[PDB]
RNA sequence: CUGAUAACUUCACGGCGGGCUUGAUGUCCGCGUCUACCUGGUGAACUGCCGAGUAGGUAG
């Protein structure tokens, strides 16, 4: 929503740090991606990564979609040991609310304190012309645009892109919380007349 | 069968010093409140004597 006509607030560099992490609508790019990804590779480990993009590139930044999740079991008790990436099942009357009424794209990474700097390149949002989602869903095909920094930035060789294609095939259905043992809030209610249900 | 069960935040602490609000000021003119008017004691606590005695004691 903040395009290249007003992409420079000219105060300091908090705009990229604000627009990477989701609490707000996102910025749209067309071909000016080299302004972002020469900082993005140098976020971990500005026109310096051009012989060392190919290090810290094996599986570390790729593995952080498995720990990326839709729903957060660490609120407000952080020792929970989960990952939940499944939206809902059902629809409501209109006076009630849920996380179904609003678009599911603000998902992020909650696993570790030392791997905070590894949630880049696969958890953020681009918003090209609408249907705003994350990067792991729209990058599962062969013919894809905006690949100028794949044909030009020659440090990124073609040996691990197919692993990123085949590793993120099906992940929208995996749910695994384990109640033995953690700090998970668990509750019981009568759903039927006799058969209670211990939901969470 | 309650986002389940459990869950002692606390110790010390000097906002003080100084300060001329004043000057002047015509509220007045006029003005018919009037008419009418039963609070009643049914008959109802008497007749005498003494006291010089509107005071005081008696008999019935």
Q: Which two tokens stand for residue A55?
A: 């290090």
CA A98 – CA A54 distance, rounded (Å): 42
In strand B, the nucleotides that come within 7 Å of a protein beta carbon are 1-4
Strand B reaches within 7 A of the A196 CB? yes
DSSP A125: B
Angle (CA) A63-A167-A51 rounded to 5° is: 60
Pairing mode, strands A187-190 and A68-69: unpaired
Name the closest nucleotide to A185, judged by C1' and CA: B3
What phi, psi does A197 have (nearest 5°)?
A: -135, 130
This structure was determined by cryo-EM
Find out whether A175 and A169 touch, Cβ atoms under 8 Å: no
Whole-number Å distance between alpha carbons of A153 and A73? 39
The nt closest to A188 (CA vs C1′) is: B1
CA distance A74 to A177: 12
A72-77: which pairs have CB atoms within 8 A and are 24 or more residues apart? A72/A110, A73/A177, A73/A184, A74/A110, A77/A183, A77/A185
| Distance (Å, whole) CA A25 – CA A16 | 12
Verify if strand B has an atom below 7 Å from the CB of A32. Answer: no
CB-CB contact of A74 with A80 (8 Å): yes
């Amino acid at each position: 929503l903040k395009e290249l006509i007003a992409s420079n607030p000219d105060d300091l560099t908090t705009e990229l740090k604000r627009a990477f992490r989701p609490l707000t609508p996102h910025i749209a790019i067309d071909g000016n991606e080299l302004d972002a990804l020469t900082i993005l590779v140098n976020l971990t480990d500005a026109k310096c990564k051009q012989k060392l993009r190919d290090e810290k590139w094996w599986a570390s930044c790729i593995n952080c979609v498995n720990y990326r999740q839709s729903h957060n079991p660490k609120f407000p008790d952080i020792r929970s040991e989960g990952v939940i990436r499944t939206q809902a099942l059902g629809e409501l009357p209109s006076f009630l609310l849920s996380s179904s009424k609003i678009p599911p794209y603000h998902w992020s990474y909650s696993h570790d304190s030392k791997y905070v700097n590894k949630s880049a390149f696969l958890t953020n949002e681009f918003c090209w012309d609408g249907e705003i989602s994350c990067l792991g869903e729209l990058l599962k095909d062969a013919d894809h645009p905006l690949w100028n920094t794949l044909k030009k930035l020659g440090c990124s060789q073609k040996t691990c892109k197919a692993m990123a294609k085949q590793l993120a095939d099906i992940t929208l259905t995996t749910i695994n919380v384990t109640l033995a043992p953690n700090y998970l809030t668990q509750i019981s209610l009568p759903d039927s007349d006799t058969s209670y249900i211990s939901l969470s």
